[PDB]
């Protein structure tokens, strides 16, 4: 009656984890290593296909994390090492006009630096941030060291290599496909009734930040609340906005750059001095826009925690600068902004906000042991205008609910962009009964 | 000199060489029973961590707790002598039944 | 053996002492003035194994 017939080229696939290649359209991310993109990428709607997605078990995020760390390490490997900087520093107060908000934030440190000749030394002075300088003793004898000298070697970032995120497209190798969930109300897990297959993902900027998600994608219709387990307080909640909140960040000090030769062709870039007065770095957000955004966030949170729950937004609990602040790279400078003025409200069911920011030059991304990066000073005045496209929240835990900003991990910023993509392996060989018999 | 934690011969001690009559070649003797060797470093040594650079630690002996004794290895005298008896029987199979194996 | 070892700061030195085996220590001269060097210093760079 019926016989086995084999079909090769069957549109069948299985969940799979593979290595995706990158594509792109003097940058810390090697956009020249990635293959040029297709000027007209294809997207094929898979009509009547329902696919189960899980953004929390997605190998594209782990791969992006690994690739971003690798690319950053690759950029720093050929750059000037700052081994000769771990010397005793003689740090005094900066003599310029310093606003009370920054009194003590900068120190004028003198030190004996190496030169192009090993039998010669030079006296060098530079401004350093308090965050980069650690006292050697209690006695206020001006002796200080760099924060990294006890635990890590410090390498200077190349001043010509940009830290600006450039969109990276992740592409499947042949025999694999990327499925995109087109359901505007998809919350990151479960069945997706509207699925398309794409050659590559959209361009995902490798933006690294904490607490606030910057320059990401917006929700198509409503603010989306996504979590691995909304009732498990050990998990982070990713809030995706449906409208951006504009944040204007600045470094108002007109900084100079002082080039010190420390070896044959090895230049150290120091702050040197500040032109004009000294003012605190800060970020502004619109007060009304932020309050409207949080109103939308609490409505969506009440959809999970109860219509009559008091949603409180509190600030970061504490511990250290990195975990308590919104960190980001703004024009090459690393800002650590105090967002306690944004998450300070109680929502009961029934102008601008200025965020002080600190700047640090000794950077340790991904909390590595044995290595640190020095960020060269950027001359002039820094200004950035970014879109806040979401939040990383944690529930206070232990009638009312309290949410706080969380730094999460870096597999939260990229996870919010890759949540709609799944990688599958194609299984082209199938068997089915037909009435066709071989001669 | 001695092969440790390897495979044992299934039946008899095996004598293997690239050329048993060429004295420039080594002879590999595979035992059919293990000989247990108990090695020790009897000194209760400390470790002294000296920082030599940013995150670069040098691990020095520092000092010794208690007295200082020589490191050594023990083997059973009878087991070793039985093992060599087997080795010389297998060597005589190649060098002559009436040869004095030293 | 006592020696002047480097520190985390390039402008500072520390006095360190350690026990070494005779096999690792080579005299510098015949005069028994306590001056010795490590056996590798004339011919090879030495790397510490990760503990």
């Amino acid at each position: 009656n019926l016989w086995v017939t084999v079909y090769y080229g069957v549109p069948v696939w299985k969940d799979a984890e593979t290595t995706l290649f990158c594509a792109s359209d003097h940058n810390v991310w090697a956009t020249h290593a990635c293959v040029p993109t297709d000027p007209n990428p294809q997207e094929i709607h898979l009509e009547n296909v329902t696919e189960e997605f899980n953004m929390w078990k997605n190998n594209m995020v782990e791969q992006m994390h690994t690739d971003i760390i690798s690319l950053w390490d690759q950029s720093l490997k050929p750059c000037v090492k700052l081994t000769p900087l771990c010397v005793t520093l003689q740090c005094t107060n900066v003599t310029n006009n310093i606003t009370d908000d920054m009194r003590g934030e900068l120190k004028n440190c003198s030190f004996n630096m190496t030169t192009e000749l090993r039998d010669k030394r030079q006296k060098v002075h530079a401004l350093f941030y308090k965050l980069d300088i650690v006292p050697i003793n209690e006695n206020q004898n001006t002796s200080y060291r760099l924060i990294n000298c006890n635990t890590a070697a410090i390498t200077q970032a190349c001043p010509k290599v940009s830290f600006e995120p450039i969109p990276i497209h992740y592409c499947a190798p042949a025999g694999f496909a990327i499925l995109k969930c087109k359901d505007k109300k998809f919350n990151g897990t479960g069945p997706c009734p509207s699925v398309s297959t794409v050659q590559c993902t959209h361009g995902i900027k490798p933006v690294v930040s904490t607490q606030l998600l910057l320059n990401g994608s917006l929700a198509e219709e409503e603010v989306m609340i996504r979590s691995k387990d909304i009732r498990n307080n050990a998990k982070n909640i990713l809030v995706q906005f449906n409208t951006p909140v504009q944040i204007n960040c600045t470094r108002p000090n007109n900084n100079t750059r002082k080039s010190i030769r420390i070896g044959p062709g090895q230049w150290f870039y120091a702050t040197g001095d500040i032109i004009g007065d000294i003012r605190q770095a800060h970020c502004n957000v619109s007060k009304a826009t932020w309050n409207e955004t949080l109103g939308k966030v609490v409505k969506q949170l009440r959809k999970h925690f109860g219509n009559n729950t008091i949603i409180r937004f509190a600030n970061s609990s504490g511990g250290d600068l990195e975990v308590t602040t919104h960190s980001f790279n703004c024009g090459g400078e690393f800002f650590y902004c105090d967002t306690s003025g944004l998450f300070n409200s109680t929502w009961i069911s029934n102008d601008s906000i200025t965020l002080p920011c600190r700047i640090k030059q000794i950077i340790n991304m991904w909390q590595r042991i044995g290595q640190a990066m020095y960020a060269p000073p950027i001359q002039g005045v820094i200004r950035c205008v970014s879109n806040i496209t979401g939040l990383i929240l944690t529930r206070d835990g232990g009638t009312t609910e309290t949410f706080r900003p969380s730094g999460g991990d870096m597999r939260d910023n990229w996870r919010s962009e890759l949540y709609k993509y799944k990688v599958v392996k194609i299984e082209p060989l199938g068997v089915a009964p037909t009435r066709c018999k071989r001669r | 000199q001695l092969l440790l934690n390897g495979s044992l011969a299934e039946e008899e001690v095996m004598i293997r060489s690239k050329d048993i009559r060429n004295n420039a070649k080594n002879i590999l003797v595979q035992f059919n029973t293990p000989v247990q060797i108990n090695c020790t470093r009897p000194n209760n040594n400390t470790r002294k961590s000296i920082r030599i650079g940013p995150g670069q630690w040098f691990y020095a002996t520092g000092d010794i707790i208690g007295d200082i004794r020589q490191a050594h290895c023990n083997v059973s005298k009878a087991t070793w002598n039985e093992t060599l008896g087997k080795v010389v029987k297998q060597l005589r199979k190649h060098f002559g039944n009436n040869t004095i194996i030293r | 053996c006592s020696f002047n070892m480097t520190t985390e700061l390039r402008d500072k030195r520390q006095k360190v002492h350690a026990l070494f085996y005779k096999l690792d220590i080579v005299p510098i001269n015949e005069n028994q003035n306590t001056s010795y060097r490590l056996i590798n210093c004339n011919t090879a760079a030495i790397t510490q194994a990760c503990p």
Partner: antibody, heavy 129, light 108 residues
Framework: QVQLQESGPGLVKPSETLSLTCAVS?????????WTWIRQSPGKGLEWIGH????????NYNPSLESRVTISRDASRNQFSLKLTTVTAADTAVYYC??????????????????????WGQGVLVTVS | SVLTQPPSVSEAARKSVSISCSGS????????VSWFQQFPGTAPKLLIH???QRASGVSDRFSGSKSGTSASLAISGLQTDDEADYYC???????????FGTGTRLTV
């Protein structure tokens, strides 16, 4: 401000595992603080056991105890706990839970090395017998 | 490792006493020193942190400093309620662990 309270068995037998849980009131265990365990043997000084960093889950243990010590946190209860395996006579001590704290004005590179145990509980006297 | 402290100190009321702490280059000579006050029957109270930062709730009688690999706690104006076991602590970078001192019993 922050209230810590230890709770757990007051007597453990030899070769069993000692499990002590510290409840935290007034401060999330997911906060970027080092939640620590410290013990004091009767008649002896204080001995640090280890800590867990609340914002990442990373832990650090006293090298003499590390192979027998697990420290963890549970955000849904706002508790953290010490699991000390293969207890012996030498493990009799008053066990305290503490918050290492830090300073939010300084980088983690510096506050990692602080010993400013700002908040302490009252302790549980554990006898191994 | 352990930080060395006097086993005990004794001084008259309303006078000053100094409790020393002696470590090595892997802890006091690298990191900062904190001081604690422990009364029999309870948990130790933090007195000083980051070498000379006074914890909230601590009177001006307590102060301290760090120099090289040594540190000390100065207690001026001694009261009869200050009889306690005082401990020093520092983070040891070679162990990657906090190390407490032996403890000094202060009587007035």
């Amino acid at each position: 401000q922050v209230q810590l309270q230890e709770s757990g068995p007051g007597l453990v037998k030899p070769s069993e595992t000692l499990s002590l849980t510290c409840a935290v009131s007034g401060n999330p265990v997911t906060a970027g603080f080092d939640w620590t365990w410290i013990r004091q043997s009767p008649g002896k000084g204080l001995e640090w056991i280890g800590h867990i960093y609340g914002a990442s889950g990373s832990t650090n243990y006293n090298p003499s105890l590390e192979s027998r010590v697990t420290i963890s946190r549970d955000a849904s209860r706002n508790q953290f706990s010490l699991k000390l395996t293969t207890v012996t006579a030498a493990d009799t001590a008053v066990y305290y839970c503490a918050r290492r704290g830090g300073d939010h004005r300084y980088s983690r590179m510096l506050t990692f090395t602080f010993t400013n145990f700002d908040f302490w509980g009252q302790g549980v006297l554990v006898t191994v017998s | 490792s352990v930080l060395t402290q006097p086993p005990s100190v004794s001084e008259a009321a309303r006078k000053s006493v100094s409790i020393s702490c002696s470590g090595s280059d892997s802890n006091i000579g690298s990191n900062s020193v904190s001081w604690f006050q422990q009364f029999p029957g309870t948990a130790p109270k933090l007195l000083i942190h980051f070498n000379n930062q006074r914890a909230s709730g601590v009177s001006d009688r307590f102060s301290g400093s760090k120099s090289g690999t040594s540190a000390s706690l100065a207690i001026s104006g001694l009261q009869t309620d200050d009889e306690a076991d005082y401990y020093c602590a520092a983070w040891d970078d070679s162990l990657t662990a906090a190390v407490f001192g032996t403890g000094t019993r202060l009587t007035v």
